Amino acid sequence: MNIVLMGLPGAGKGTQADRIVEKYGIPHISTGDMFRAAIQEGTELGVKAKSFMDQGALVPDEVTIGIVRERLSKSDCDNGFLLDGFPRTVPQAEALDQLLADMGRKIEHVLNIQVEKEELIARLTGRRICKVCGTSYHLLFNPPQVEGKCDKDGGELYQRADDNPDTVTNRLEVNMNQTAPLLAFYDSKEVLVNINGQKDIKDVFKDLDVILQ
Ligand SMILES: Nc1ncnc2c1ncn2[C@@H]1O[C@H](COP(=O)(O)OP(=O)(O)OP(=O)(O)OP(=O)(O)OP(=O)(O)OC[C@H]2O[C@@H](n3cnc4c(N)ncnc43)[C@H](O)[C@@H]2O)[C@@H](O)[C@H]1O
Ligand SMILES: [Zn+2]
């Protein structure tokens, strides 16, 4: 089960990932989580990634492909994996084909979660993230059971610094700059499915899960 969960910032990739991972027990590999981990280690990689992330810019492709090479070569991905927000560029996409072709494998499904820009913006305005596990809530649209506390581990919730309005606008634009030619890459190789992400979390999930089996 070699999957890519694709979508613009705030499309519900993280939200849908928890469901796919919990159901099929394949590792969730998000580049954005990895960069935040490196920032928490305070590695040099993290310090350098963070300049870009704070602007809402992409982290350079070579850096990014790097950590993905390393990560997907770990034995826990041998039987499958859920890439989340990678690739975002044609060179990332290619380097992914190549590193998998070296292992006698390929990506088998790119699930592209589509949401209009205005909705994406509303989603990243009230978003909250768990200190303990990294899961996201939304104060309006998908709140925790108990205010301020994650439903999974009781973790405190907080606001990601890049979820401010200026950085969000930058993030949507930058990522969209990459999107159509990448859809065209995957659409042409016959693995891309578009998914209406603009409805209930459970309903988006059914659409995904249809494809997964
Ligand atoms: N491959 C790469 N190349 C280069 N640089 C890279 C890279 N990967 C990362 N980077 C760098 O790292 C940075 C951060 O990356 P990262 O943090 O991965 O991602 P992002 O692009 O910032 O967007 P997310 O993946 O955080 O959003 P998502 O769709 O998972 O949203 P969620 O499910 O929370 O949902 C959003 C909100 O909506 C709510 N919600 C979810 N589903 C629904 C629904 N159906 N209806 C209503 N509300 C919903 C949630 O509760 C939540 O509040 C980038 O800006 C870049 O600098
Ligand atoms: Zn949590």
Numbering used by the authors: 1 to 213
The study reports:
Structural studies have revealed three characteristic AK domains, namely, the CORE, AMPbind, and LID domains. In the present study, a structural comparison of AKp and AKm revealed suboptimal hydrophobic packing in the CORE domain of the psychrophilic homologue, where a polar side chain makes contact with hydrophobic neighboring residues. We also determined the crystal structures of two AK mutants, which showed the largest thermal stability transition compared to wild-type (WT) AKs.
The psychrophilic AKp contains a more polar Thr26 instead of the Ile residue. These observations strongly suggest that Thr26 in AKp disrupts hydrophobic packing in the CORE domain and likely decreases its thermal stability compared to other AKs including AKm. The AKp T26I mutant showed increased catalytic activities at high temperatures (55 and 65 °C) compared to WT enzyme, and the temperature of maximum activity shifted from 45 °C to 55 °C by the mutation. Interestingly, the Thr-to-Ile mutation did not significantly affect the catalytic activity of AKp at relatively low temperatures (5 °C to 45 °C). The T26I mutant of AKp shows an average B-factor (50.0 Å2) similar to that of WT AKp (51.4 Å2) for all protein atoms (residues 1–213), whereas the average value for atoms of Ile26 (53.0 Å2) in the mutant is considerably smaller than that of Thr26 (60.7 Å2) in the WT structure, even though the side chain of Ile is longer than that of Thr. These observations suggest that the flexibility of residue 26 is decreased by Thr-to-Ile substitution in AKp, and the relative rigidity of the mutated Ile26 likely results from enhanced hydrophobic interactions with neighboring residues in the CORE domain.
